[PDB]
Amino acid sequence: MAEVEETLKRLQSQKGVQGIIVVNTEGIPIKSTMDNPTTTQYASLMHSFILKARSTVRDIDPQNDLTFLRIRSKKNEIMVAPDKDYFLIVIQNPTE
Amino acid sequence: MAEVEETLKRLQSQKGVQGIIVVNTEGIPIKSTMDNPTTTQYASLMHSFILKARSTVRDIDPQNDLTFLRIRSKKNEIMVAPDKDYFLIVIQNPTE
């Protein structure tokens, strides 16, 4: 999980990134670099969302496996990155 | 496609960025800063992949609609950004 701690501390430096979440395969968020429940919410949602992608990638091309994601929105933005058996989250704010 | 030409020329500066593609709302890739058909592929698939998200953002919160996208596969990462009615496309490689 340290390698992820490196894929995390990196966003930590980015601008706007206020917190990050690190869940495992079971679907339970192991670490939570945010208020307290923010990890619990993104762990029950961002968990299934990133999953709908890791699979689609194969449909369009089983050779281009997935490795990291990034979705921008209005209220803010969210960086992601599923490691070997875990996945990360990055709630960062735009224009800060 | 001017304001977009600004959301584009920006990536143009990025490094790994090798090309870009512009589409509208009908799904037709208006412009194409890449191969001849490479745009047709990123213009017919990037439209359905970004929809799976634009719908999720609403689920978690219909008040926080989406705004832009960005994914990272094994070869490189495809950046995107659907404006009022024109979405853009990007193909820049990671590992700066």
From Swiss-Prot, chains A, B:
Disulfide bonds: none annotated. Its main location: cytoplasm. It is found in: Cytoplasm, Cytoskeleton. Acts as one of several non-catalytic accessory components of the cytoplasmic dynein 1 complex that are thought to be involved in linking dynein to cargos and to adapter proteins that regulate dynein function. Cytoplasmic dynein 1 acts as a motor for the intracellular retrograde motility of vesicles and organelles along microtubules. SMART domains: Robl_LC7. High expression in heart, liver, brain and pancreas; moderate in placenta, skeletal muscle and kidney; low in lung, prostate, testis, small intestine and colon. Isoform 1 expression is up-regulated in 64% hepatocellular carcinoma (HCC) patients. SUPFAM superfamilies: Roadblock/LC7 domain. InterPro entries: DYNLRB1/2 (IPR016561), Roadblock/LAMTOR2_dom (IPR004942). Pfam families: Robl_LC7 (PF03259). Homodimer. The cytoplasmic dynein 1 complex consists of two catalytic heavy chains (HCs) and a number of non-catalytic subunits presented by intermediate chains (ICs), light intermediate chains (LICs) and light chains (LCs); the composition seems to vary in respect to the IC, LIC and LC composition. The heavy chain homodimer serves as a scaffold for the probable homodimeric assembly of the respective non-catalytic subunits. The ICs and LICs bind directly to the HC dimer and the LCs assemble on the IC dimer. Interacts with DYNLRB2. Interacts with DYNC1I1 and DYNC1I2. It comes from Homo sapiens. Belongs to the GAMAD family. The keyword Transport applies. Keywords: Acetylation, Cytoplasm, Cytoskeleton, Dynein, Microtubule, Motor protein, Transport. GO terms for biological process: microtubule-based movement; visual behavior. The modification N-acetylalanine is found at residue 2. GO terms for molecular function: dynein intermediate chain binding; identical protein binding; microtubule motor activity. GO terms for cellular component: centrosome; ciliary tip; cilium; cytoplasm; cytoplasmic dynein complex; dynein complex; membrane; microtubule. This is Dynein light chain roadblock-type 1.
